[PDB]
């Protein structure tokens, strides 16, 4: 039963990245101001925060099994910090242009970064953060990268060139390129995590969200209702819903069978930029970052 409760919300500078820790009740936010924050959303006290840089930090993920966070910023750098001590673990120039998105492999010591330099890069932390591969082919900014959780030897990249490319690690060309028909670009791509559907979802400045069958490459559905750029759309990992967020200031919760909107939320933090869902669905938590702060919600 959908019963949305605000578990914790705080104001800050614009939140561009956000992520949940899988075992501590913590959320990481990465800010346009160069600051990152880790909050305990149950006690409502900061665990740790760092002034990383003076440029925006658009991307940040926990790497829980190593006690790290990894972040990427407009100064072209990837940094990794130990969240227990604050210590900086590594600091390197990853691309010659902004970093939009970082994904962490669930099982292997790999990280993907996607950038305005038109590539995705694969880094290996068990090989001194060596660059192991550069995936070339996109023709505008790479806005989003995400591993297929059912087969993390493959990953999807979403691009302002209006395509999604799906790639295999260790192979230089995409397995396939999806021509989205989202003419203003793709801001975000996400996989449905369960084995019953081979689905991906994309979000666009053209105000649409689209569901794809990645076996047949067909568009299964198009979800309309947002009134400004759609920054993200994801499938909830346990509940039968899709969650999206937009520069129109709303989050929307859509029924994932009927693709109809169930609930529209204006949390009143202005434009929405990023999303995370709790990996194990603890309290069905989701969190979103906005112009004016973040919010952590229990969906029921």
């Amino acid at each position: 039963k959908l019963d949305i409760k605000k578990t914790f919300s705080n104001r800050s500078d614009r939140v561009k990245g956000i992520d949940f820790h899988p075992t501590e009740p913590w959320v990481l936010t990465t800010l346009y101001s160069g600051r990152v924050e880790i909050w305990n959303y149950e006690t409502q006290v900061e665990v740790r925060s760092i002034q990383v840089t003076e440029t925006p930090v658009r991307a940040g993920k926990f790497i829980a099994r190593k006690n790290w966070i990894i972040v990427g910023s407009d100064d072209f750098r990837i940094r990794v910090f130990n969240y227990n001590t604050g210590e900086k673990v590594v600091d390197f120039e990853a691309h010659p242009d902004y970093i939009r998105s970082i994904a962490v492999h669930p099982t292997k010591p790999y990280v993907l970064s996607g950038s305005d330099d038109l590539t995705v890069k694969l880094w290996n932390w068990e090989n001194n953060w060596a660059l192991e591969q550069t995936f070339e082919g996109h023709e505008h900014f790479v806005m989003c990268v995400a591993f297929n959780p059912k087969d993390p030897s493959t990953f999807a990249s979403g691009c302002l060139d209006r395509t999604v490319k799906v790639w295999s690690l260790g192979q230089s060309t995409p397995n396939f390129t999806l021509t989205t028909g989202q003419e203003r670009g793709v801001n975000y791509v996400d996989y449905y995590p369960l084995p019953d559907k081979p689905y991906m979802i994309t979000a666009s400045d053209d105000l649409t969200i689209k569901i794809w069958d990645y076996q047949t490459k067909s568009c299964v559905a198009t979800l309309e209702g947002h009134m400004s750029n759609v920054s993200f759309a994801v499938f909830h990992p346990t509940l039968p819903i899709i969650i999206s967020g937009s520069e129109d200031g709303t989050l929307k919760i859509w029924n994932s069978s009927t693709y109809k909107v169930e609930k529209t939320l204006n949390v009143g933090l202005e434009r929405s930029w990023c999303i995370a869902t709790h990996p194990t669905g603890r309290k069905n938590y989701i969190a979103s970052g906005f112009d004016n702060g973040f919010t952590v919600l229990s969906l029921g």
């Binding site: 614009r14 346009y32 939009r100 900014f141 806005m143 302002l160 434009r271």
Partner: peptide
């Protein structure tokens, strides 16, 4: 820059 914000 596109997508500056």
């Amino acid at each position: 820059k596109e997508k500056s914000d």
